[PDB]
C-alpha cells in the first residue's frame, strides 16, 4: 501494499543565528506516492511558505539545469514541482531564498503533494517559518 502517498518538504537554514543564514536560505521538496496504477508517471507538487522572502527565480532554473529534466517552478511566493521519471521511486528537489527587506507578516506555511490523478491519493503536510526574525539591522 500500500501506499499510498507521502510527501517531503523541508528546509536548510544553517542555523539561525547568523546573518547568513537569514541573508540566504535553502528550502527541499520531495514527492513520494505509490498506488497502484500503472501508471505514471509524473510527479506534481506545490508549496507555499513565508512568503515572505525573495527566491531566485534563476536559481529554481538551476534545478532544470540538471539534466534538462526535473522540473520545478516558484512563484516567489510558492513553488512548485515537477518531474517524470519513474519508476519507481520517489523525487526530491532543492531551492534557495533570500531575503531583503523586512516585512511584516506573520503567517504559517502550508504544502501539498499530487501525483495524478485521481482520487485519492495524495499528500498533504503544512509548514511554518523556520525561525523567523528579524531584525535587523541594520
Do not use: W
Not at 526530491?92 to 504559517?108: A, E
Amino acid at each position: 501494499e500500500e501506499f499510498p502517498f507521502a510527501l517531503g518538504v523541508q528546509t536548510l537554514p544553517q542555523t539561525c543565528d547568523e546573518p547568513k543564514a537569514h541573508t540566504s536560505f535553502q528550502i527541499s521538496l520531495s514527492v513520494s506516492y505509490t498506488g497502484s496504477r500503472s501508471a505514471s508517471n509524473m510527479a506534481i507538487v506545490d508549496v507555499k511558505m513565508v512568503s515572505g522572502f525573495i527566491p531566485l527565480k534563476p536559481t529554481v532554473k538551476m534545478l532544470e539545469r540538471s539534466n534538462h529534466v526535473s522540473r520545478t517552478e516558484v512563484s516567489s511566493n510558492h513553488v512548485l514541482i515537477y518531474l517524470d521519471k519513474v519508476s519507481n521511486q520517489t523525487l526530491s528537489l532543492f531551492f534557495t531564498v533570500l531575503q531583503d527587506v523586512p516585512v511584516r507578516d506573520l503567517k504559517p506555511a502550508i504544502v501539498k503533494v499530487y501525483d495524478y490523478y485521481e482520487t485519492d491519493e495524495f499528500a498533504i503536510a503544512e509548514y511554518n517559518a523556520p525561525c523567523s526574525k528579524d531584525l535587523g539591522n541594520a
